Amino acid sequence: SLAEIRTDFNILYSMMKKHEEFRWMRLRIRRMADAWIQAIKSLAEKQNLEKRKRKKVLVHLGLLTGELVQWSDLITSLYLLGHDIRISASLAELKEIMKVGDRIVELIYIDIVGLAQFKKTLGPSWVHYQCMLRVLDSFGTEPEFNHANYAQSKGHKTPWGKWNLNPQQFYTMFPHTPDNSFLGFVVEQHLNSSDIHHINEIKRQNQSLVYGKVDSFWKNKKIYLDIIHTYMEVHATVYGSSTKNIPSYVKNHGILSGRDLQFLLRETKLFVGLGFPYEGPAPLEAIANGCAFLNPKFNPPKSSKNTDFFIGKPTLRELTSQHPYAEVFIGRPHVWTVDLNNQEEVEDAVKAILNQKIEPYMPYEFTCEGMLQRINAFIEKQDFCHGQVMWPPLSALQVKLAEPGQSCKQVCQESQLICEPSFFQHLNKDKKVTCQSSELAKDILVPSFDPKNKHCVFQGDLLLFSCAGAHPRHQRVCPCRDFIKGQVALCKDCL
Numbered sequence: 001s002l003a004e005i006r007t008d009f010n011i012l013y014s015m016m017k018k019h020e021e022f023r024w025m026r027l028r029i030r031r032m033a034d035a036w037i038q039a040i041k042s043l044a045e046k047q048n049l050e051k052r053k054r055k056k057v058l059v060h061l062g063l064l065t066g067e068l069v070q071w072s073d074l075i076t077s078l079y080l081l082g083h084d085i086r087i088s089a090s091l092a093e094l095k096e097i098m099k100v101g102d103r104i105v106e107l108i109y110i111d112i113v114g115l116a117q118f119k120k121t122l123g124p125s126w127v128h129y130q131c132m133l134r135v136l137d138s139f140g141t142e143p144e145f146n147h148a149n150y151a152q153s154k155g156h157k158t159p160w161g162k163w164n165l166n167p168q169q170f171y172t173m174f175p176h177t178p179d180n181s182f183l184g185f186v187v188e189q190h191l192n193s194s195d196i197h198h199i200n201e202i203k204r205q206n207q208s209l210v211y212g213k214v215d216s217f218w219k220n221k222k223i224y225l226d227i228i229h230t231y232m233e234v235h236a237t238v239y240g241s242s243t244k245n246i247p248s249y250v251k252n253h254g255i256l257s258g259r260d261l262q263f264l265l266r267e268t269k270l271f272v273g274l275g276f277p278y279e280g281p282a283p284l285e286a287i288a289n290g291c292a293f294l295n296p297k298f299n300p301p302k303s304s305k306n307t308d309f310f311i312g313k314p315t316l317r318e319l320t321s322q323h324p325y326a327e328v329f330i331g332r333p334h335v336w337t338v339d340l341n342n343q344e345e346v347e348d349a350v351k352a353i354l355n356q357k358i359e360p361y362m363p364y365e366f367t368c369e370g371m372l373q374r375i376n377a378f379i380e381k382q383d384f385c386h387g388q389v390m391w392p393p394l395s396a397l398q399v400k401l402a403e404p405g406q407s408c409k410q411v412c413q414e415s416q417l418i419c420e421p422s423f424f425q426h427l428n429k430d431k432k433v434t435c436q437s438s439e440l441a442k443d444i445l446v447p448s449f450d451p452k453n454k455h456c457v458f459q460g461d462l463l464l465f466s467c468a469g470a471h472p473r474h475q476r477v478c479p480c481r482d483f484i485k486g487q488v489a490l491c492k493d494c495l
């Protein structure tokens, strides 16, 4: 009934042998297995992992009836932590795994596809298991969209969301929506021992490498690159089917293996964002190998509102730059977020970059070990099956008052904290805000204070608490917590 840190992928490998569909994940796991095992050992030496209940866990990949990376890293983490995993990837496997006053599973990891299938399967008993769902939703689901009646009342047209879960049951690829939990993935290193001793030998050159494998992504960026070029060589890894948009002076390497790319990143001073693709791993991989990242700034920020790429998403989350995580959670000196319309700002950033030495940096949360700490913490401390939650600890709460036009998400972030939605239920009374009157409302923007009238508005619907949302007129009362540098998902007391 207690859980045992596994270090032998044999049992796993036979589990993942049972479908061709799993081959790509098998290969990923096999490749990283040494890193994965050093990780679980290393964690078990800095953390007592000896006192944990073995949990029976469904995982259902509707996807199989980016993602597969996260699935790989999740499934692997569940194994190394010693839990009893039932992988399903078909209606029949799911239907079999399911069909006294007990529960047949304690955790369920699933994607949006699988959730429709899970619901259709369990029918009425849905409710007996919904507190256990952990929904892999890369782009996230904001409370305004999760909550069906309210979405309808706001006239939202997207068929997505409307599941009425606790929004912390949504698991995202990057920490962009603090209404949801951050699961993430591991940024792979393709370097063995001989490469490590060789990684040293590589002398870094005053040369740039452009981010983008496709000629399309380069379109109308000549002015931007010409500024880079002024000061350093410009290398690419572009699939050269067409080169219509590639300046003549670009030194193309073509598509490289992960191994070869990492060696190239080691002789590169600057990795250059073109503005697409949005929040991918490549810039983390660059920063890890000691490159700086030139991060195009978005004015206005891009969202489901103004960008065809995001239309229909059940979230109004905005991108302030091509890589908001790199912008907010790494920043200078490693990351230089700059407006491409501001030619002077770009030139300055490039001049500044060329005159600083910066050490490599991989955030703890995007390693095998950080991921294991992070998932272990969610499994051991995050329970929705016993009503209102007590983790993270209330000791972590630090209230801020967002000014009109500012979300709780922003006010916490701008003060180097993260909005913690589980603290919202404790902001129910005024005990620099004193009310002369209060009312109840079912709105994502409350609790709110009107400092003109000294009128407070409290949340009347537990499912409408939102880190997301700004009041045009009023101040929002906001629950923030501290977080660990490199491990945003946790606070210091979160232990």
Ligand SMILES: *[C@@H]1O[C@H](CO[C@@H]2O[C@@H](C)[C@@H](O)[C@@H](O)[C@@H]2O)[C@@H](O)[C@H](O)[C@H]1NC(C)=O
Residues within 6 Å of the ligand: 204, 205, 206, 231, 351, 354, 355
């Ligand atoms: C890389 O550049 C370092 C600093 O560069 C300086 O500023 C740029 C804008 C130019 O003015 C450049 O000539 C200056 O040195 C140098 O200290 C260093 O030698 C260079 N390293 C390599 C690998 O070439």
Ligand SMILES: *[C@@H]1O[C@H](CO)[C@@H](O)[C@H](O)[C@H]1NC(C)=O
Residues within 6 Å of the ligand: 192, 193, 194, 195
């Ligand atoms: C590292 O990988 C390369 C590339 O295939 C291989 O030839 C080399 O022998 C490896 N070195 C070690 C120490 O595993």
